[PDB]
């Protein structure tokens, strides 16, 4: 019920609330998938209560009691997410050998750059889709000048950076 959006009524008004440590990844790995699925919602309800208290403290212009609790919960939920991801990643490699779940390709855009393109889901094949065909994945010859200008501009930045490092070392050696 709505009472779960707040802390235990006894704690209201207290300056501190005792809390334990956040879940580490290795401990989570021992647990099963079903246990992790349940553990997610147990953490989720704690998260909502802590977000609720944080906003109320701002409204009343008072310090939030034991703010470190929020960080621990968020860290725990992140570790749960990756552990599940690790299991899925390994299984996908064995059955399909693909390193990414979403299809994509390397393509050149109209500005002369090389970018990774993520695909979308469509009900019809590409050669019949008139909205997709208006998109261009090639560069015309007027772009070649700008490709050279980009390369040279990047070269100037690198030279200045290496020069600065050498000069800084001179100062350190003199000082020490």
């Amino acid at each position: 019920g709505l009472e779960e959006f707040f802390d235990d009524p006894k704690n209201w008004g207290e300056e501190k609330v005792k809390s334990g440590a956040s879940w580490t990844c290795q401990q989570l790995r021992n647990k099963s998938n079903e246990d992790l699925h349940k553990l997610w919602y147990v953490l989720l309800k704690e998260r909502n209560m802590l977000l609720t208290l944080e906003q109320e403290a701002k409204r009343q212009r008072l310090p939030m009691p034991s703010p470190e609790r929020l960080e621990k919960v968020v860290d725990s939920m992140d570790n749960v997410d990756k552990v599940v991801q690790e299991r899925e990643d390994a299984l996908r490699l064995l059955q399909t050998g693909q390193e990414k779940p979403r299809p994509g390709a390397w393509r050149r855009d109209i500005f002369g750059r090389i970018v990774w393109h993520k695909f979308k889901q469509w009900p019809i094949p590409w050669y019949l889709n008139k909205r997709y065909n208006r998109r261009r994945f090639f560069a015309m010859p007027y772009v070649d000048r700008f490709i050279r200008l980009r390369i040279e501009k990047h070269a100037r930045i690198e030279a200045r950076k290496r020069s600065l490092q050498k000069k800084k070392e001179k100062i350190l050696h003199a000082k020490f």
Binding site: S19, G20, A21, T24, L39, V42, V73
Partner: peptide
């Protein structure tokens, strides 16, 4: 369910 948000130090 025996698991809770926090763990002992």
């Amino acid at each position: 369910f025996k698991l809770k948000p926090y763990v002992n130090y």
